[PDB]
Design a protein around this ligand. Structure first.
Ligand code: NI
Length: 341
């Protein structure tokens, strides 16, 4: 059964609720982004209307084979009417095609669902500036002050300079990047670009990347592994066994692997600066874990909320424990008292 925090009251609508069967009274299913915890339950047999971005609709059609007739793509930053209710989609600064949804209820309430997001000051000059939001359904993934990480710009800078140095010292080194869902594409794209190579990958991953409307993509990626010196692999293979094995297959083209695991947050953020990060090494294989996040830091989240000044906040992440729920409610109150709303 569908939880309350996936329901938009006063409407026929749910959000990211595809794993509950037929939801009683839901007449349109919104999907915020193509990550499996959120799409769970969609397939080619789904027969109700789905509303989402263009990119999210490309993946629905090509990867889960949902029939065209039920996919309803919407443009961003545009007032649209759905079953008599005004809605707007906004960039969530998460993975490709990830949106926030504004619902303008018939009775005058305004609701913002962030879906998954990385808060940014640039959202303060979206169509959010123009009016008041009563309810915020918030991605509270890193809602605790210990969650700090660098900007995405600093992390990419670290990865580019690391890879460029290594390969210029040893032209026979191969660079490998771990992946398991969409998002974080900039990690492997920016590395390839500085190395003058295309990114090589399996057919299934190539297909996935072909749905994301990235400009000049055909110039950046390929299925011919032999022609590329940056290879993508499944995240589970980004370990010393997985990498030695993969090196066998390259057939004596390369004598060194430099690999990157893009994670979210890890406790080595409590002590270490991005500049100071070092790999784990075994023989001719080094692995760097790098804190490239697509969720709000605690401070980025706080700023966004204190700008928005919502009347009520409903968390969508970390909701299954009382300790979490209680901790989050305390920060909400602090933030409200500090800013004075
Ligand atoms: Ni996500």
């Amino acid at each position: 059964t569908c939880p309350f925090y996936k329901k938009i009251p006063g409407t026929g609508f749910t959000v990211d609720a595809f794993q509950y069967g037929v939801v009683e009274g839901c007449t349109a299913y919104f999907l915020t982004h193509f990550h499996s915890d959120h799409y769970a339950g969609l397939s080619k047999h789904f027969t109700f209307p789905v509303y989402c971005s263009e990119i999210t609709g490309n993946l629905l059609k090509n990867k889960l084979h949902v029939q065209e007739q039920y996919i309803h793509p919407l443009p961003l930053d545009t007032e649209c009417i759905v079953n008599g209710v005004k809605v707007v989609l906004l960039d969530a600064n998460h993975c490709p095609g990830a949106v926030m949804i504004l619902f303008y209820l018939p009775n005058g309430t305004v609701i913002l669902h962030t879906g998954d997001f990385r808060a940014d000051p640039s959202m303060e000059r979206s169509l959010l500036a123009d009016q008041k939001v009563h309810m915020l359904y918030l991605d509270t993934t890193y809602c605790s002050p210990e969650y700090t990480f660098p900007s995405q710009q600093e992390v990419i800078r670290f990865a580019i300079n690391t890879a460029f140095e290594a390969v210029t010292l040893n032209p026979h080194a191969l660079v490998v990047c771990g992946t398991y869902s969409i998002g974080k594409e900039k990690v492997f794209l920016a590395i390839a670009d500085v190395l003058g190579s295309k990114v090589g990958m399996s057919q299934e991953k190539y297909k996935t990347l072909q749905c994301l409307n990235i400009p000049e993509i055909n110039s950046l990626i390929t299925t011919d592994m032999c022609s590329s010196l940056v290879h993508l692999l499944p995240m589970m293979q980004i370990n010393f066994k997985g990498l030695q094995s993969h090196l066998k297959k390259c057939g004596g083209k390369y004598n060194q692997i430099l690999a990157f695991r893009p994670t979210g947050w890890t406790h080595s953020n409590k002590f270490t600066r991005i500049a100071d990060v070092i790999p784990q090494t075994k023989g001719n294989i080094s692995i760097y874990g790098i804190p490239y996040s697509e969720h709000s830091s605690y401070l980025e989240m706080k700023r966004f909320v204190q700008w928005l000044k919502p009347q009520k906040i409903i968390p969508t992440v970390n909701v299954g424990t009382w300790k979490s729920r209680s901790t989050m409610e305390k920060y909400f109150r602090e933030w409200k008292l500090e800013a004075g709303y």
